[PDB]
Design a protein around this nucleic acid. Structure first.
Length: 274
RNA sequence: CUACCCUUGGUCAGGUUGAAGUUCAGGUAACACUGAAUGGAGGACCGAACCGACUUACGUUGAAAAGUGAGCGGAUGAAC
RNA sequence: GUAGCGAAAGACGGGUGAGAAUCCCGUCCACCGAUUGACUAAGGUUUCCAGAGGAAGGCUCGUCCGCUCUGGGUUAGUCGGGUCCUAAGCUGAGGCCGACAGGCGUAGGCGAUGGAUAACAGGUUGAUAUUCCUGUACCACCUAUAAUCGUUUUAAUCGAUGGGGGGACGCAGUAGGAUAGGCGAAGCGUGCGAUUGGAUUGCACGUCUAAGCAGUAAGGCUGAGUAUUAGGCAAAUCCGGUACUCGUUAAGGCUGAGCUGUGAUGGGGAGAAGACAUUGUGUCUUCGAGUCGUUGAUUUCACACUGCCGAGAAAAGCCUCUAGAUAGAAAAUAGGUGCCCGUACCGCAAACCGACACAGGUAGUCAAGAUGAGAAUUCUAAGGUGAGCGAGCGAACUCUCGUUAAGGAACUCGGCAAAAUGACCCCGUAACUUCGGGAGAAGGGGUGCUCUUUAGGGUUAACGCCCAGAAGAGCCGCAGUGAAUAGGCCCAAGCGACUGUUUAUCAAAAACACAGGUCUCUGCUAAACCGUAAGGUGAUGUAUAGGGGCUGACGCCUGCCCGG
RNA sequence: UAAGGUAGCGAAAUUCCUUGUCGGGUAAGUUCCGACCCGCACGAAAGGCGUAACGAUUUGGGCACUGUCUCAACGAGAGAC
RNA sequence: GGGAUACUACCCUAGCUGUGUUGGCUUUCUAACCCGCACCACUUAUCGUGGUGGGAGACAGUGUCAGGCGGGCAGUUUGAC
RNA sequence: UGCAUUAGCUAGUUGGUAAGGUAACGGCUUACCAAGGCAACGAUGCAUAGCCGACCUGAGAGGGUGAUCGGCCACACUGGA
RNA sequence: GGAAAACUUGAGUGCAGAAGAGGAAAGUGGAAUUCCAUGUGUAGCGGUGAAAUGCGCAGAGAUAUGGAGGAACACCAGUGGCGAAGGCGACUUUCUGGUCUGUAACUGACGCUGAUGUGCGAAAGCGUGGGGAUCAAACAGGAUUAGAUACCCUGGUAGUCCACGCCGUAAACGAUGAGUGCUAAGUGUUAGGGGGUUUCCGCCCCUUAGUGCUGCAGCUAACGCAUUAAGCACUCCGCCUGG
RNA sequence: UAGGAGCUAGCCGUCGAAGGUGGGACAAAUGAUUGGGGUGAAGUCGUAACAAGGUAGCCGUAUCGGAAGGUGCGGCUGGAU
C-alpha cells in the first residue's frame, strides 16, 4: 500500500512512500551485478548536454533478461527484489539446471510459480511468447520491436498494451499512451501487466529527497538575463512577451510538433496520440 | 583561485524532544478508549569542533589589495 | 629628526666581552594549556649540527643563525613508495570520421585518493634511527639434506588459457563483551618538616614488546550424510534445483573471534648512591628495591545484531574442484641470499601560500587533574614560551575597559550600542492549530554550611563510601549555580509556506530553489542537446518514462472573449 | 472587432488628488490597527483569498532594563619628554 | 427558335479489337542501397570484417540546383536640424 | 424554589485508631490504616428567597401575599480578634 | 408488602412439515447501448412538436456463422411471501436467520414498556479501486418561440453500477407507540393441520395463523374506523398544550 | 540580687482577615461600523403557489441562480390519465 507520514517536521507534512510489501528479499544476486558510474548529463566531450542530472545515491546495475531467450525450460520464481534503476521491481528466476536470471516482475506473480518461454508456452502471467501465438484481447508487456532484440515497449511500472487484431505479418497493438501500432508478429511479449502499480502516488515531500535521486534544481527562464534565455530580462516580473513560449535554445515550446517527416515507421502507425 | 560534476576517502563534544510501532492496565468492559512501560524517527530543537557572514565597534599612506573584537546563522544533512 | 617600529610580563644576580634592556647560566615570577603542546601529510629544499670573523642581512648587537670553512650530517628483506591490482579519467594497432592540422573509438595499456603484503624490546650521537648496535623474531628465494606419494594416467604434487566461491563494501540505533587509560586504599618503599599546632605523616610507588604454547568472552550457520544432471565454450572428484536420515539440538559439528595465563624475561629497567681511589664524584666495572589489592571504564569484537530507503565499486592476492601434464614430490633441517627510491630540518609555521621573521590560510592522528552533561567554563600537569630588537619617563584627545546620585528611551531615522535574561531542580502554562505543535509560552518558587535520620541512588556489605531519600533541627553573611560560562519576553500586522541558495570584495532579501499543480512535446537509432562529421548524453531508460514552459506547501477556489 | 471584470480583496510592497474620511491607541499619531469604497491605475496558475509552524526579513505598540539621553571620575594603550 | 450537326477537332452521352514502340499514375517485386538487427567465427575483442536468416527498399540517406521560413546567430544603421 | 443548555462529587474527605473539651459528642484538629464515602432518587454547583403561624380567594381537591399581626432565626459602616 | 406451593393457556425448551426477493460467498447462460474488424456499399445515417448541430465518402450505421467490453438479468411477477425498519427479484449451490401451522410433550409465568446504551439506517454529499457502456448534475451544440442554452434533442463531467469509509438525516406515514380481555357480518386469498364425496388432483366444507375487500353497535368536528378499530376496558413509555 | 520556674519584655516558626498584584474565568455596559429579523408604506419589478394556475405536488438530499426558482437521486399521495 502506501504509508502516510505523521507531520512531525515541516518537511514531512505531506509525504508518502511505498511500504515495499511486495519485496520479499532485500539483497541482490551477486553474479548479476555490474557497476554503473554516474555521467551526470555530460557526453564524451565532457560537456553538459542535458540539464538537471546530478548526483544521487550510488547504485549498481542489475542485468535484466529483456529478450526471453531460454526456451522450453521452465523456471521457478525465487524472489521479488527492489531495483534502483527502474520503477518496476524485479524477479529472480532460476531455471531447471541452475541458471539464474532477473526479469521484470509482473503484477500478480508469486514466489514459487513457474515461468517459461516459447511458442509452446501457454497464456498465463509472466510467460513470454511470439505475438503470433498470443490471442487477441489480452494485455501484454515487455514487447519487442525487432525479433530477438529484446523487449522495449511497456516496461515501466504499471504498464501494458493489448493485442487488437492481426494483419498479414503484423499485429495491431494499442500502446499505453493511447496510440495503436503495428508490430512484427515474430516479436515476443510477456503476458500481463508490469507490477508495482502505486509508484505514481508517492509524494516526494521534501526538496532533498529529490536530490537523493540525482535531480539538480531547475531555474525558470523568465528570471534569467537576456543573454541566457529568450524569456529573460524585464524590469519587474514580466509576461512572456513573445508570440510563443521558447526553449532556452530558442525554439517554440508549447505545441509545435517535433517528430520528423519521412520516418520509415510512419506507415506502421495507424492512429497516434501524444 | 573559483562554478558545476566524476571516482575514491574522511569528520561531526554534549544535551533535549520522543514518530511509526509494540506491549500491560487505571475508566475499564464485548480492551476500549487512554494511562504506564518499551522503542528510537526527524532536510527536529538548544549548543562546542567545523562551516558561514546578519549587526556593531575598530582598522582605512591598515598587522591584512577584505582582517580583528564582541555578539550572530547552520551544526545527521539539498552538511562539511 | 616627523609617522611608524606588527597583539602578549618580566625582575635581579652571575658570566663573557673592545663594548650588554639585547647573548649565556641561575633563581623567582608569569603566559598557553582540545593548546602558542606532541606526531603524520602536502609544500619548501640544506634552513639541520659544530667551530670561527660576520664589511652587508635582522624595524639592535654578535658578544646567533637562515654570510665562510668544512667538521660535516640522512644507513631499512619487515616503515612509506616501485619490481602487484584495478576506479574516474587519459591514451589506444587494426577501425570510423574529417580542407589540412586533426577528432572519435576496439581489444589492450597507463592510472590511488581504494584493495593486497613480513618487527618488536632495549642501548647509543653534536647531528639519523622500527634503518646503526644487542637480543628475540617473522617473510621470501636458492642450493645441499633425509623417511615418505610412487601405471605417473591417476596419485596429497603438478594444473589451466577452466570453473565455482571469496575478496566485496549504505545509514541510523542498541545491547553486551573485553581492553587502554584514569582511581581509592598500609602490600611496599622516603622522609619527619621550623612561623602555631598535628605526627595514621607528608607522600609516592607497584613495571616490560612483537613473535609462539595453551584456551576464549561472544558472533554467523535450511546446522552433518545418499542418487541424478537442459549447464559452468570441453575435465572436474567443485559450483545450483529437487527426492531423503538425526532435522528447527548447537550440543559443540564447522568457519571465523576480541582477549587472558605460561614461558619471551631469573633479561631489560626499576621509586634506588647502598659502589669509588674516578669518567669535573655529576658519572658508574661489582653488588639488590616491591611485582599487592580495589573501584569504575574510551578504542576493538563487528555495520555483529536490529531497523530503514535513497538500495549502498572493481580487479588481483586468496580458497576450492579438475582436465591435462609429468618422476615427484615436501618437508623439516643446515646453509646461503634479500635489489631500487625516500629518510637531515621546518611543518596548523621565522623554513609552506600570502612582496615581509605579515594578528590571515593550511588535510589527518594523540590529548592528563579539578569542575561539570560536556572536548563548555575557570584554574592547572606534562610540554612549550616570555614575542622575537625597540626601550625608559608621565596633559588635551582618540580607542578598549569598569563605576555612577535622581530620573528611565525624554536619545535617535530607528532602543543602534549597552544593560537586563541565562545553569540545575520543583510548580504552573493562553489564543490558535495542518493535532505535530505553539512551549523553555507567559508566570512562580528553590539552591551555602553543620548536626541528627527514618532512608534512599544505594558505595549497599549498611547506616559507614560519595551524592543524598529528602525530612527535621541549627549556624553565618549585604548577597549561597556567592567566580566564569549558560534564552530577554509579550501583543499586533506585511511578505515568503517550510530546511536550503545568492551578488569572492558596499545588497542575504519579499529575489532563486523546493515539495506539489498544470500545459505541451516525444513509440525508441525517441524528442531534446553537444559536434562539421563520426561519436555521444538522454539511458545500459521505454509514456506510472524522458525533455521543455509557466506556477509554487496546504485549504477554498480559478469567471468572460478564439475577432487579432 | 471578439468580449467589456464572476468570486474574493481593496487609500493595499498597488491611491494622483492625499497626511482621503470616521473610530482605536498617545497629553500630543503623516506611521500603525479596524472600518468605508469615490479600485487615477486590484483581480483569479507573469494565479486570487486565507493560513498553523518557520525567519540575523519588513513594520507598529508594551514590560524588563539601562550613561542612549537631561548632564563627571578611574585603569590600560597611542599621543607628550 | 435562347445556342446548332456540309468538310473538319470529332465527341460527354461512350462500349471499345489489337497495334512499332514513347511517356505519366498506383501497386507489387528484388539484385543497388540502408538497419544503435538477430545468430555464428576472426576473437584476444559486443569496435570492426565475413557468413546465414530477418526488416526495409528504389524510398530513405548523401551530392548539386531551386523556392520558402529563419534576432537562433552576425555585420551595420538609427537620416540630418 | 428552579436549572443535566449543572453528572461523576468529596480526599481530614470517607469509616475507624489515640490526645484534647465541650454543659457533652465526634474528622472538630492532630500521628495511623483501606480508598473509601457521596451520588441520575440529579450528590456537586449555579441562580433566587429569612421561615412558619397568619392573610387571601377558591365547591372541595387548595395553592398565591407577609405592609399587616404574632412566634422563631439573622444583622447593627465593613471585616477580623 | 414479605413468608411458604401448584396450574398452564402467556412465554420459552420439544416433535411433523410448508414457502420465499432474508443477509454474507461460488457457477451457468441469454439479450441489449459502446468499440475495433470482416462481408457489404455510397448517399446520406442519426436527431427533430419544427428543422438543424452532429455523425457521412476513411465506408459513418448496416448486416450474420461468428470477436470482445460495461452492467444488470423481462417470462414464473401477485390488495403474493419473507424482514423490526431502511428493505428484500434471472437463477444453481454454500452458511444460516426468521415466519407459520399441527401434536401440543415439558419449565412452572420465566412478561410488557422500554429512559441509558447499541444497531440498522433510503437517497444525495465527504473520498479509494474497478466507472464514464448506457444514464447524467455542471458544461456544450442546434433551432423553435415574440423571447435561449428554457418545453425538443443529443454529446458529455464527476456522480453513476459495485466493492472499500461513513455521515445519521425522508411524506422513513398504516400521517395510528408497545403487551392483554370483549362486541353484526359477508368476501376472496398465503402456509399448515381436518375431512365428505371423489377428481382423473377436482367439488364442498371445519380450523389455525394471516393476506384483502365490502360492510352493525360504538366513535369523532366530520371524514372515515368497525377483528389487519380511531369501539368497549387494563399496564407502561414518550409527547403536547396560540402563531 | 530578683539568678533560676514562670510572668512583662525578647526572639523563633504554624495558621490568618484584608491587602497587593498576578493570570485568567464569569457577568454586565459601551463601541466607528455591520447583518439577519419585525412593522409600515407595500414606492417598485416579476408572477412563482391556489384552476392538471399555462411546464402536478411533498419530504430527505445535492447543486446552480441575487431571489423566485433550476436540476438530480431515493421515498410518500396529501394528484390528473
Amino acid at each position: 500500500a502506501i504509508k502516510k507520514y505523521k507531520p512531525i517536521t515541516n518537511g514531512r507534512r505531506n509525504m508518502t512512500s511505498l511500504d515495499f510489501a511486495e519485496i520479499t528479499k532485500t539483497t541482490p544476486e551477486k553474479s548479476l551485478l555490474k557497476p554503473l558510474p554516474k555521467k551526470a548529463g555530460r557526453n564524451n566531450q565532457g560537456k553538459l548536454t542535458v540539464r538537471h542530472h546530478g548526483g544521487g545515491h550510488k547504485r549498481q546495475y542489475r542485468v535484466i533478461d529483456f529478450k526471453r531467450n531460454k526456451d522450453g525450460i521452465n523456471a521457478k520464481v525465487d524472489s521479488i527484489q527492489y531495483d534502483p534503476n527502474r520503477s518496476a521491481n524485479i524477479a529472480l528466476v532460476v531455471y531447471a539446471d541452475g541458471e539464474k536470471r532477473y526479469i521484470i516482475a509482473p503484477k500478480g506473480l508469486e514466489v514459487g510459480q513457474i515461468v517459461e518461454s516459447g511458442a509452446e508456452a501457454d497464456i498465463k502471467v509472466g510467460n513470454a511468447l511470439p505475438l503470433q501465438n498470443i490471442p487477441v484481447g489480452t494485455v501484454v508487456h515487455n514487447i519487442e520491436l525487432k525479433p530477438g532484440k529484446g523487449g522495449q515497449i511497456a516496461r515501466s511500472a504499471g504498464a501494458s498494451a493489448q493485442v487488437l487484431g492481426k494483419e498479414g505479418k503484423y499485429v495491431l497493438i494499442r500502446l499505453r499512451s493511447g496510440e495503436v501500432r503495428m508490430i512484427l508478429s515474430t516479436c515476443r511479449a510477456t503476458i500481463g501487466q508490469v507490477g508495482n502499480l502505486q509508484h505514481e502516488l508517492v509524494n516526494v515531500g521534501k526538496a532533498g529527497r529529490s536530490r537523493w535521486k540525482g535531480i539538480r534544481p531547475t531555474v525558470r527562464g523568465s528570471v534569467m538575463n537576456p543573454n541566457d534565455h529568450p524569456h529573460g530580462g524585464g524590469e519587474g516580473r514580466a509576461p512572456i512577451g513573445r508570440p510563443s513560449p521558447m526553449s532556452p535554445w530558442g525554439k517554440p515550446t508549447l505545441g509545435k510538433k517535433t517528430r520528423r517527416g519521412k520516418k520509415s515507421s510512419d506507415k506502421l502507425i495507424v492512429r497516434g496520440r501524444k
